Design a protein around this ligand. Sequence first.
Ligand code: HEM
Ligand SMILES: CCCCCCCCCCCCCCCC[N+](C)(C)C
Length: 440
Amino acid sequence: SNTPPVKPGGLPLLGHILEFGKNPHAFLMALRHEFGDVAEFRMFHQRMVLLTGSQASEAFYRAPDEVLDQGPAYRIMTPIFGRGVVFDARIERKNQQLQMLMPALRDKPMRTYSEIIVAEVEAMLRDWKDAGTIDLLELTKELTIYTSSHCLLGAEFRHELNTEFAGIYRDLEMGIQPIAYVFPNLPLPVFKRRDQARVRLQELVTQIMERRARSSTNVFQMLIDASYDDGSKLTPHEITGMLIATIFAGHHTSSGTTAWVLIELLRRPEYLRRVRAEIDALFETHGRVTFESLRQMPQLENVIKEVLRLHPPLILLMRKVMKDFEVQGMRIEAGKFVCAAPSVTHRIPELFPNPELFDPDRYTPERAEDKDLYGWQAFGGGRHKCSGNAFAMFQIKAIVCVLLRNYEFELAAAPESYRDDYRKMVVEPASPCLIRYRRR
Ligand code: HEM
Ligand SMILES: CCCCCCCCCCCCCCCC[N+](C)(C)C
């Protein structure tokens, strides 16, 4: 039929990758502005169709796995995750493993997660000096990696094996290099150290499984106790892969959004006063942080929601088109890729009036702009929506509570200097991001 519009200029081998790399958010904004809800560009030799707006986002998220494949986008992560683990397995096994992941990340385990998250933040606060200058993102990355490793992997990783796991994690993360998009299977020393790190982490998982069989609430144990539709149990390879995938999934996303919550609150003393009022009221009615965060935090909840609207950490959601797909009268042929851009759809004026303004009261029950499910798309949507939704929200909300209760903060640079680095694989606050603290 009528194919989607194609961005007119490009390089032969690279397509639009240079313009994309300069500012990805700007590139996607510009494609929408010039071509519309369904617009095609090229990265290297591959053709991507950006789907923006509620309609096209519904098309994207609502499409079945037999139509839109999640596999190829994760090809770089396969040496870390493992051969037959999530996204490199066939659709059935992939989805069964992901469903195994789902329960451990919501509902009942959250209350046990809460105590340790609060305890970790308190512990870090105790050994700081009374006042100083820190990097906010550095702090949030350390806090979120510690708390999520403890909650999801187990106490063994935060305590006895902490040093070796820190090493293995930095080696694995250093193994996630973009060059692999261009030249896959290129031999690199960082890749050698990544592979060795994965071997060692699988050894550690095997050991801990054996010891736990001799003798806790965590994703590690939920995967030990989980089974397929067949009575077959998960191998140590599969368990180590799925665990490291969850750890990687939540680290930079949650850290960046916590950082942005703090930055925006310090930028806007109105909302900082509202949120601190909520914190001080909850600390009186419900002594201590506790699970009081989970529930009666509406103001901080909406602050986090608007933070995710204006700074969504995942800016491009890519899937290959397996069967001819049609959006808005336009045919997307198999072999093309489709993409969802939360940063672009969140800034559509029809969906969000005055899009560049930061007002968390967009999400009040009276206005309900997060109602579409295919407009506000920070956690994705559909079958493959975020399974770490509640855990991430709670981690952010709890970390902000303990920090804001125990310390008072001042922005160490210009309020307008704090910006997004869209050139990062998971978008985070900009490199300097410095703050000052003094204890209350
Ligand atoms: C505010 C922080 C977070 C954001 C913005 C976020 C966002 C997203 C998005 C947009 C997707 C869909 C990707 C796609 O469509 O293919 C996704 C998937 C996923 N997220 Fe998150 N996430 C966050 C935190 C977390 C955390 C903390 C965890 C684990 C503790 C987690 C676990 C997952 C998993 C397992 C999936 C896979 C869904 C599937 O493919 O079936 N996420 N996330
Ligand atoms: C269930 C699995 C969901 C997806 C998990 C993996 C998400 C992507 C992890 C990206 C890691 C970002 C940090 C690596 C950045 C690369 N550099 C180290 C070279 C900067």
